[PDB]
Amino acid sequence: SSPVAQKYDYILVGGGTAACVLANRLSADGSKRVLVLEAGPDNTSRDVKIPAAITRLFRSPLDWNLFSELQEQLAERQIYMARGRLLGGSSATNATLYHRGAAGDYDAWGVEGWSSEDVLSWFVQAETNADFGPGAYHGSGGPMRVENPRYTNKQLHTAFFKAAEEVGLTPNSDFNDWSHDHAGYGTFQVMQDKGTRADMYRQYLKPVLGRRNLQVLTGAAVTKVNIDQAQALGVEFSTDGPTGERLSAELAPGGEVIMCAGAVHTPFLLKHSGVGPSAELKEFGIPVVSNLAGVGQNLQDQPACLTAAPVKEKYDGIAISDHIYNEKGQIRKRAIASYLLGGRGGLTSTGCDRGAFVRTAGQALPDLQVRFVPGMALDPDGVSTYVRFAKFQSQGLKWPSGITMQLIACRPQSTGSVGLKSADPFAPPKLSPGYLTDKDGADLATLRKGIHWARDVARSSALSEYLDGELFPGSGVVSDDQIDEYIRRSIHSSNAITGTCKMGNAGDSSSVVDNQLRVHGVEGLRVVDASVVPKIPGGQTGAPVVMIAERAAALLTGKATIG
Ligand SMILES: Cc1cc2nc3c(=O)[nH]c(=O)nc-3n(C[C@H](O)[C@H](O)[C@H](O)COP(=O)(O)OP(=O)(O)OC[C@H]3O[C@@H](n4cnc5c(N)ncnc54)[C@H](O)[C@@H]3O)c2cc1C
Ligand SMILES: CCCCCCCCCCCCCCCCCC(=O)O
């Protein structure tokens, strides 16, 4: 009753990160009617705009609240996997860190037309950077806003860089400069606009919300993709939810459906639509249109553990939690003033924007990413500590001053999978991260060596001046076996998730889309989101998604070609 006798040249399944990019570029003429279905609500929450409010988005109504299956290798735990639920998707709920990884990450893709030389100009075209001048590696006319963090913890951040130098790291002045080595310590740039989150809704969708040929339905949960027998013809959805009407949106001649539901929901909606491994589809009675085995396989996510330690009493009050909460847990008006009046202060921080890439054992590229947080974790699950920090407000307690180092296997070898658990297209998918399952135990070894690394850093002269012992994992965790166990019981997502409908060369019986993002053996069906990533780059994945999305968009409108 919203697409009534209307036909669309492009239907966008999901209004997330890549979705926002595509709607902008494809609607930019006027001949193409574009439809954007988003299951979550509109992007208006003040928790979304303030970076420090990321603490409130986890396990909120703006999150899918996805929980993984039992992981037997993780002490029989279910792993919470944050995913954004609103216009702009995860770019509106994320830590705002801006990373491209290394050039070799894209060369390792092996896919024709998507080498590092091919992708570079698209990163740059999308970017306006407040702190690097225009060059081969940075842009100034682009829709993204990228800036150095506008919060510095004068004492703890400098101690961290002194400690990294003391144990033998060198600085990296730009982790996204492919002209030098990825490894090193420094400051991560952030996808922010003078301290306001610069998510893809704000940067791409919101400016073009006036075009008459662009229709953006929120509260619109898609259930399947109409594939008449093979050629897609539209989608089915519901504006109320599981207890609503089954609306249908038709496509114009030549109209294409583009999946933008993310690496969790795109392979899931594809399986409900008959695109998947037949054995899995038969088990729920779904007709097989395309029998591609890679739909849902190859899920890559970057697991994390942490160390945490308090400052000496002589340094009580210098952590970021002391810049946000007062001793009774209410937000300090000084922090509120600095944010609103100047875009400065603790409120501009997602907390984990300084760090390092380290090779734990002479790998071709760093296997370890370090995120230093000048606040003290109180749960070894770093996501849980963020949730706990939100609910700590006004509770009348003083959050203790300290530091945390989060350790991330950033180029992991373990792969996971996404599947069906019900025939209910509104049921949660069958989600298995598969952390620590690679046959060599390289991911466990990366994280275990990360713990040793962080302890050496904590023991340096520069940090030992500030620190007073260690809370996590603590004095009791001494042997490699104990470290390994501590990791199994605390490991959490650094929140990537890529690879579940991967792209590849013709004759890749393992891939799902071709180097032009069309799914094999279906007409008018393309995937443009984090699913198509064949091998996760080092670092956080939001920026490469935007790059894939800009490049797709230009390909569809004949501005560029691939191969
Ligand atoms: C908590 C968190 C922290 C992160 N931190 C960072 C970081 O610091 N830096 C960074 O670069 N990356 C980060 N990431 C990752 C980055 O945000 C994502 O990798 C990227 O945004 C993925 O883009 P996408 O378009 O593939 O998916 P999304 O942006 O998630 O888009 C998918 C969209 O599809 C919608 N959808 C799903 N199912 C349906 C349906 N049935 N009907 C309609 N709509 C549907 C969803 O609601 C969502 O809006 C973070 C991720 C999260 C979750
Ligand atoms: C932004 C406000 C800072 C709050 C500080 C809380 C104390 C520090 C806990 C650190 C835990 C490790 C970092 C986990 C980061 C999770 C965010 C993400 O992965 O998207």
CATH classification of the domain holding 379: 3.30.410.40
In 3D, which of 95, 94, 96, 93 has the Cα closest to residue 43?
93
CA proximity to 94, closest of 209, 16, 205: 16
**Is the CB of 265 within 6 Å of ligand 1?**
yes
289 and 352 housed in the same domain: no
Cα 379 to averaged position of ligand 1 atoms, centre (Å)? 25
Are the beta carbons of 142 and 132 closer than 8 angstroms? no
Q: Is residue 120 part of a domain?
A: no
Residue 59 lies in a domain: no
Domain shared by 360 and 348, yes or no: yes
343 and 474 part of one domain = yes
Report if residue 378 sits inside a domain.
yes
125 and 118 Cβ atoms separated by less than 8 Å: no
Whether ligand 2 lies within 6 angstroms of the CB of 404 is answered as yes
Q: Are residues 231 and 373 in the same domain?
A: no
Dump the DSSP string for 171-239: B-S-TT-TTS-S-EEEEPPBSEETTEE--HIIIIIGGGTT-TTEEEEES-EEEEEEEE--EEEEEEEES
In a domain, 117, yes or no: no
Could you tell me the CATH number of the domain that includes residue 513?
Answer: 3.50.50.60
State CA 460 to chain mean position distance.
32
Please tell me the residue having the least CA distance from ligand 1 atom 53. 83
Q: Rounded to an integer, what distance in angstroms lies between the CA atom of residue 401 and that of residue 153? A: 13
- Asked if residue 261 has its Cβ within 6 Å of ligand 1, the reply is yes
Specify the number of domains making up the chain: 2
Binding residues for FAD: 17-18, 38, 86, 90, 94-97, 222, 542
Q: Which atom of ligand 1 is nearest to the CA of 83?
A: 53
Regarding the beta carbon of 425 and ligand 1, being less than 6 Å apart is answered no
Q: Are residues 287 and 341 in the same domain?
A: no
Binding region: 17-18, 38, 86, 90, 94-97, 222, 352, 371, 386, 406, 542
Judge if 345 and 482 occupy the same domain: yes
Of 20, 88, 87, 94, the residue nearest 57 (C-alpha): 94
Question: Is residue 310 assigned to a domain?
Answer: yes
Q: Are 203 and 143 in contact (CB under 8 A)?
A: yes
Place of tokens 């842009």: 139
**27 inside domain:** yes
Do residues 340 and 387 both lie within one domain?
Answer: yes
Do 399 and 340 lie in one domain? The reply is yes
Does a structural domain hold residue 37? Answer: yes
Residues 292 and 331 in one domain: no
Domain membership of residue 552 (yes or no) is no
SS3 at position 356: strand
User: 278: part of which helix (H) or strand (E)?
Assistant: helix 278-282
Domain that holds residue 228: 7-45+200-299+498-537
Pocket lining: 21 vs ligand 2, CB cutoff 6 Å: no
Helix (H) or strand (E) holding 483: helix 480-490
